[PDB]
Design a protein around this ligand. Structure first.
Ligand SMILES: *[C@@H]1O[C@H](CO)[C@@H](O[C@@H]2O[C@H](CO)[C@@H](O)[C@H](O)[C@H]2NC(C)=O)[C@H](O)[C@H]1NC(C)=O
Ligand SMILES: *[C@@H]1O[C@H](CO)[C@@H](O)[C@H](O)[C@H]1NC(C)=O
Ligand SMILES: *[C@@H]1O[C@H](CO)[C@@H](O)[C@H](O)[C@H]1NC(C)=O
Ligand SMILES: *[C@@H]1O[C@H](CO)[C@@H](O)[C@H](O)[C@H]1NC(C)=O
Ligand SMILES: *[C@@H]1O[C@H](CO)[C@@H](O)[C@H](O)[C@H]1NC(C)=O
Ligand SMILES: *[C@@H]1O[C@H](CO)[C@@H](O)[C@H](O)[C@H]1NC(C)=O
Ligand SMILES: *[C@@H]1O[C@H](CO)[C@@H](O)[C@H](O)[C@H]1NC(C)=O
Ligand SMILES: *[C@@H]1O[C@H](CO)[C@@H](O)[C@H](O)[C@H]1NC(C)=O
Ligand SMILES: *[C@@H]1O[C@H](CO)[C@@H](O)[C@H](O)[C@H]1NC(C)=O
Ligand SMILES: *[C@@H]1O[C@H](CO)[C@@H](O)[C@H](O)[C@H]1NC(C)=O
Lengths: 114, 214, 171, 49, 19
């Protein structure tokens, strides 16, 4: 049994806490121990509340700093929004808003010669 | 608010800092690979030449030459790959400039999210930053609708907009902004009878010329 | 894994390999970059919808039958029959080599697809530009007919034939 | 973006014929687009001026 | 309500006809 180990870290800027992910390993053969499709995760507790993905682990699970401890959770794709469909009713915008979206794109590299 | 968005988020220009970081890392690793011995007795040709005589030092010099040639070949291969990537990125940026700054593109999600109005380019050290001014509906309301109006035994369809109702009354309004107008012959056109259309309703289509002609 | 692949368990081989330099740093960096690039591609492709929209329980849209593209709860994974056929028709650590899983699972991709389908069939093109305005599907079809240069009456006078042809086309 | 979340005037980007709408479908390693388009027929001859 | 509005005659084609 072998596999690479990755270190989940919130950054030394925030805290020194860290959780280790043994990729593909089933930890039945090597404080909270949690098994995921991406491997076994030690040092992070599985929270059942779904949040946005902060640090991607794999197989739909991500980790983040709770604020206090490193929590693992199934990422949420978005908030549910049921649309009231009807063959005799419509929704029309009585207003509007002008927004300005910022976009960035690289155009050139550093010209180099050896 | 654009300036506040650019100031509060330090990682907003990460897509542009990444290329500079990659070039710096490539140059750094290409400089550091010189210390590699590549299986030779030393990494410095000066010592390799000073210690040994040409006959037996030729093999070591050839080993180091092979190693450094392979390293430079890999470096230039990675450079060509990244250059192709940045060429694709520059083509995309030029297309965006042409289709958003020099005009208005009906493309639904090219010049930012929402109905595009206009754009403004801004310079950057190694890229371009686009300020996509867009139009987003808001504050919507429910309404009752029908695909046509049955009047005088004839079907009436809207030239522009849709029929809407708030109870006991009907109006025409453009789809992207609520502006109720009276249903008249100026904003509707007739096509066939009103028995074939599904879900048609009956309402008075006021003739704008009848009151004055009477 | 450079050690496992090139040398394996040979410690003298590892010592000899350490003389070659930082080739393996570049190798691992490129592999992780490719992985992150594939993940970013999947995200940019399948996460374009803002929120997970829902579909009404009454699956009637003026004669148009979407049962072949809408999800079917009659099976474990909430995938449409067309998606099930597409998945069935496609077939899918060894001494260093490993295959990392994607971030978005097949179920999450199917949920994104179902949200996109619900949005498209329930609010026209508006959900991709702002608030999802609920609009009838025959009126969406009239909008698009006008978009292709055909008047709305051409639709409203053939709605039945058009819906039948669309169902036959999906079949 | 172009076909699903809207209606494109591009004559050949969202399938053959005049494009009405498109529906995405997931796949293990890709996406399958079902382009619903409009195609005329019965091109009768007429005299024009 | 409009800014910069000006004045000019807007003829109605129904008047000369007098239907
Ligand atoms: C459309 O929206 C704008 C802003 O969202 C509305 O403008 C506001 O109007 C109220 C009352 O007239 C003012 O107190 C606010 O200060 C206005 N907002 C701004 C930013 O100036 C506008 O009234 C809306 N139009 C309709 C028809 O509802
Ligand atoms: C530390 O800095 C990183 C880098 O911007 C930031 O993401 C993180 O929120 C910071 N943490 C704290 C506690 O300031
Ligand atoms: C790990 O091993 C246990 C015990 O054999 C098994 O029940 C479980 O399914 C395994 N999980 C993985 C991800 O291999
Ligand atoms: C999440 O739910 C599981 C299953 O009930 C439970 O074992 C676990 O403790 C829960 N997590 C938290 C943070 O309560
Ligand atoms: C339309 O009515 C539904 C309830 O049937 C409500 O949830 C929805 O918010 C209404 N639409 C708007 C724009 O308020
Ligand atoms: C519907 O809107 C019109 C707008 O002119 C108004 O005069 C009428 O009173 C409204 N009716 C109801 C029932 O709200
Ligand atoms: C609208 O839908 C309802 C419920 O499906 C149905 O009873 C009604 O007949 C429909 N309206 C038309 C005009 O078909
Ligand atoms: C849609 O077609 C399928 C397959 O032919 C059929 O089972 C289903 O009943 C149809 N939908 C309706 C509403 O009849
Ligand atoms: C129109 O005329 C051409 C030339 O005579 C002929 O080939 C064509 O079949 C005619 N159109 C139809 C629909 O038959
Ligand atoms: C247009 O006429 C109105 C009243 O006749 C007057 O108040 C206004 O100042 C005029 N504007 C111009 C530009 O002539």
């Amino acid at each position: 049994s072998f596999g690479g180990v990755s270190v989940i870290t919130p950054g030394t800027n925030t805290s020194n806490q860290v959780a280790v992910l043994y990729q593909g390993v089933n930890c039945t053969e090597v404080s909270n121990v949690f098994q995921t499709r991406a491997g076994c995760l030690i040092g992070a507790e599985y929270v059942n509340n779904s949040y946005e993905c902060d640090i991607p682990i794999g197989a739909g699970i991500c980790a983040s700093y709770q604020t206090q401890s490193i929590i693992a959770y199934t990422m949420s794709l978005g908030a549910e929004n049921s649309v009231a469909y009807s063959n005799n009713s419509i929704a029309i915008p009585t207003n509007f808003t002008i927004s300005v979206t910022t976009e960035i794109l690289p155009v050139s590299m550093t010209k180099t010669s050896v | 608010k654009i300036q506040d968005s650019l100031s509060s988020t330090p990682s907003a220009l990460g897509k542009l800092q990444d290329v500079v970081n990659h070039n710096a890392q490539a140059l750094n690793t290409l400089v550091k690979q010189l210390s590699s011995k590549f299986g030779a007795i030393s990494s410095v040709l000066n010592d390799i030449l000073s210690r040994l005589d040409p006959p037996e030092a030729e093999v070591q010099i050839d080993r180091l030459i092979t190693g450094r040639l392979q390293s430079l070949q890999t470096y230039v291969t990675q450079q060509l790959i990244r250059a192709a990537e940045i060429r694709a990125s520059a083509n995309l940026a030029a297309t965006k400039m042409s289709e958003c700054v020099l005009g208005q593109s009906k493309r639904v999600d090219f010049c930012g999210k929402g109905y595009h109005l206009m754009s403004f380019p801004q310079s950057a050290p190694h890229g371009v930053v686009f300020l996509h001014v867009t139009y987003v509906p808001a504050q919507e309301k429910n309404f009752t609708t029908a695909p046509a109006i049955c009047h005088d035994g004839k079907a009436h369809f809207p030239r522009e907009g849709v029929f809407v109702s708030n109870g006991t009354h009907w109006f025409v309004t453009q789809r992207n902004f609520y502006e109720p107008q009276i249903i008249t012959t100026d904003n509707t056109f007739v096509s066939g009878n009103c028995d074939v259309v599904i879900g048609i309703v009956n309402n008075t289509v006021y003739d704008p010329l009848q009151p004055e002609l009477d | 894994d450079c050690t496992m692949y090139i040398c394996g368990d040979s410690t003298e081989c590892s010592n000899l390999l350490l003389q070659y330099g930082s080739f393996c740093t570049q190798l691992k960096r490129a592999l992780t970059g490719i992985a992150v690039e594939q993940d970013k591609n999947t995200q940019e492709v399948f996460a374009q919808v803002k929120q997970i929209y829902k579909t009404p329980p009454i699956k009637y849209f003026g004669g148009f039958n979407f049962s072949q593209i809408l999800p079917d709860p009659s099976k474990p994974s909430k995938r449409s029959p067309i998606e099930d056929l597409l998945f069935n028709k496609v077939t899918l650590k060894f001494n260093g080599l490993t295959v990392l899983p994607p971030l978005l699972t097949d179920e999450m991709i199917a949920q994104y697809t179902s949200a996109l389908l619900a949005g498209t069939i329930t609010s026209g093109w508006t959900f991709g530009a702002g608030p999802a305005l609920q609009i009838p599907f025959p009126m969406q079809m009239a909008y698009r007919f006008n978009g292709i240069g055909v008047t709305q009456n051409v639709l409203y006078e053939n709605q039945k034939l058009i819906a039948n042809q669309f169902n036959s086309a999906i079949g």
